[PDB]
Design a protein around this ligand. Structure first.
Ligand SMILES: Nc1ncnc2c1nc(Sc1cc3c(cc1I)OCO3)n2CCCCCC[PH](c1ccccc1)(c1ccccc1)c1ccccc1
Length: 432
C-alpha cells in the first residue's frame, strides 16, 4: 500500500507582494547556483537535510512541551509530465518573518537545477498562517498568504529543460540511497520507503551493541566478516567528530559524512595512507582536499593511542593484528617525516627479545625499563630465534647485562634502521 502525503491543497486568494533580493543574499545565491557544488544532484541531499532539521526541532519542541507527536516524515515526489520534483516535510515551518528574511543556505542549491521554485510553508506555532513563496533565480521573489498549507514545508522544483533527469523516479532513488540512507526521519519517494539504515555513529558508544556494529561494518566495508577491532570516537572538544573505525577479521574505504549525510564515499585523505586498511565512517560538521589535515592528524593520534590501549589489554590478539597489518605500520613509519610521528607509529611495533620466551613480544617503549639510564637500543634482526639466541654478536651482549631485540625478516630491520632513534635514543644492531 502506497503512503503519500503530497497533494495540491494549496490556494492563493490575494496577490503576491514582490520582493527584491538584497545585495549580499543575491550574490551568494548566484554562487550557490553555479559555483559552490560540483555535482548537480546534491540539491536533493541539502533539501532533505533541511527537512531533517525542521522535523528535529518540531520533535524537540513537542517533546519539551510534552505534547503528542504527529507524523514526522519526509516525502519526495517526481512528476515527469509537469517536469517537477517536490520535497515536503511535516516538520516545524517558517514564519512570514523567516520567509521574508531567509543551515539554511543549502536551499538555494535548488536553483542549480531549477528554472522556477514554488514553496509553501506553515509554521508549527499555534494559529499560524501558511504562505506561498515564488522565485525564478532572479533578484526577485514573490510572497503571498496561502491556504491549504499543511504544517511544515513544501518545496516544488520546476526543472530546467536539461536538468529534467531529476524528474525520474530511478535517478532520484539512486541519489537518495547514495546520500541520505541514514536520515533520522522516515523518507518516502512516491510513496515508497527508502532509508532503513541507522547512523549508529551518532549514538552514545555505550548504547551500540555488536550486532549493530557488525551490520554497519558489513555495510561500509562491503564485507561479510566481522570487525576484529572497533573504535567509537566522539569529540566536541578541539573539533566535532563522530566516527567509527573497524579492523576486519580478514587479512588484506572510510566514508566521509557530515550531519548524517554523505559527502565522500571513498574519502581517501581523511586518514594517513598507512591507515587505509581501517574501515568505517567519519562524521564532522566542518566539511564543505585542501585542508582536511588537522582532522587526519587527530584521527591518527587517537587511532594510534587506540591500538596501544588494545596492546595493553589483550596481547595475543594485538600480536595477530601486528602480524596481519604490521606491514602498513612499517610502511607508514618509513613514509613519515617528523621523528615523533615515526616514533608514534613505532609505538605500535612488536618484536621478540632476549629476556622474553620465544613468541613473547614487546614494544620499543616497554622493556626499555630494565634498561639502566645512560643509553641505547640494540637489536639483531636475524633469520631465527635459535640462530640469534646462539649468535656470536649477541653473546657479546648476553652477560654485559643488556637486552637485545630479535627481527627475523629484512623489512623489520630496514624499518628499525630508518627509525634510527626512538625517544631521543638511538637504535643500532649488535652487528656493529
Ligand atoms: N524545510 C524547512 N523547514 C523549515 N525551515 C527551513 C526549511 N528549509 C530552510 S532553508 C531556506 C528555505 C527557504 C528560504 C530560505 C532558506 I535559508 O526561502 C524560501 O524557502 N529553512 C530555513 C530555516 C533555517 C534558517 C533559520 C531562520 P533564523 C532568522 C533570523 C532572523 C530573522 C528571521 C529568521 C532563526 C530564528 C530563530 C531561531 C533560530 C534561527 C537565522 C539564524 C541564523 C542565521 C540566519 C537566519
Amino acid at each position: 500500500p502506497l503512503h503519500s502525503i503530497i497533494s495540491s491543497t494549496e490556494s492563493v486568494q490575494g496577490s503576491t507582494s514582490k520582493h527584491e533580493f538584497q545585495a549580499e543574499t543575491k550574490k551568494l545565491l548566484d554562487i550557490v547556483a553555479r559555483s559552490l557544488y560540483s555535482e548537480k544532484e546534491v540539491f536533493i541531499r541539502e533539501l532533505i537535510s533541511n527537512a531533517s532539521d525542521a522535523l528535529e526541532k518540531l520533535r524537540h519542541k513537542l517533546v519539551s512541551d510534552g505534547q503528542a507527536l504527529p507524523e514526522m516524515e519526509i516525502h519526495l515526489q517526481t512528476n515527469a509530465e509537469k517536469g517537477t520534483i517536490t520535497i515536503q516535510d511535516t516538520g516545524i515551518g517558517m514564519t512570514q518573518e523567516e520567509l521574508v528574511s531567509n543551515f539554511g543556505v543549502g536551499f538555494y542549491s535548488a536553483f542549480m537545477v531549477a528554472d522556477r521554485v514554488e514553496v509553501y510553508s506553515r509554521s508549527a506555532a499555534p494559529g499560524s498562517l501558511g504562505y506561498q513563496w515564488l522565485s525564478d533565480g532572479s533578484g526577485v521573489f514573490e510572497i503571498a498568504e496561502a491556504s491549504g498549507v499543511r504544517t511544515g514545508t513544501k518545496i516544488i522544483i520546476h526543472l530546467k529543460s536539461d536538468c529534467k533527469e531529476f524528474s525520474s523516479e530511478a535517478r532520484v532513488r539512486d541519489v537518495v540511497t547514495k546520500y541520505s540512507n541514514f536520515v533520522s526521519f522516515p523518507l518516502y519517494l512516491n510513496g515508497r520507503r527508502m532509508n532503513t539504515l541507522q547512523a549508529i555513529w551518532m549514538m552514545d558508544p555505550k548504547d551500540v551493541r555488536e550486532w549493530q556494529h557488525e551490520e554497519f561494518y558489513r555495510y561500509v566495508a562491503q564485507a561479510h566478516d566481522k570487525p576484529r577491532y572497533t573504535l567509537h570516537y566522539k569529540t566536541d572538544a578541539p573539533l566535532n567528530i563522530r566516527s567509527i573505525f573497524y579492523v576486519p577479521d580478514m587479512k588484506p574505504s572510510v566514508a566521509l559524512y557530515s550531519r548524517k549525510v554523505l559527502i565522500q564515499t571513498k574519502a581517501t585523505d581523511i586518514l594517513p595512507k598507512w591507515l587505509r586498511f581501517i574501515r568505517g565512517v567519519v562524521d564532522s560538521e566542518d566539511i564543505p582536499s585542501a585542508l582536511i589535515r588537522k582532522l587526519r592528524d587527530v584521527l591518527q593520534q587517537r587511532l594510534i593511542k587506540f591500538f596501544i590501549d588494545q596492546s595493553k589489554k589483550d596481547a595475543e590478539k594485538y600480536a595477530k593484528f601486528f602480524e596481519d597489518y604490521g606491514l602498513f605500520m612499517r610502511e607508514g613509519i618509513v613514509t613519515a617525516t617528523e621523528q615523533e610521528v615515526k616514533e608514534d607509529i613505532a609505538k605500535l611495533l612488536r618484536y621478540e627479545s632476549s629476556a622474553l620466551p620465544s613468541g613473547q613480544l614487546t614494544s620499543l617503549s616497554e622493556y626499555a625499563s630494565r634498561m639502566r639510564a645512560g643509553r641505547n637500543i640494540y637489536y639483531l634482526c636475524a633469520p631465527n630465534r635459535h640462530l640469534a639466541e646462539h649468535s656470536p654478536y649477541y653473546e657479546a651482549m648476553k652477560k654485559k647485562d643488556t637486552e637485545v631485540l630479535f627481527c627475523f625478516e629484512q623489512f623489520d630491520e630496514l624499518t628499525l634502521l630508518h627509525l634510527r632513534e626512538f625517544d631521543k635514543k638511538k637504535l643500532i644492531s649488535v652487528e656493529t
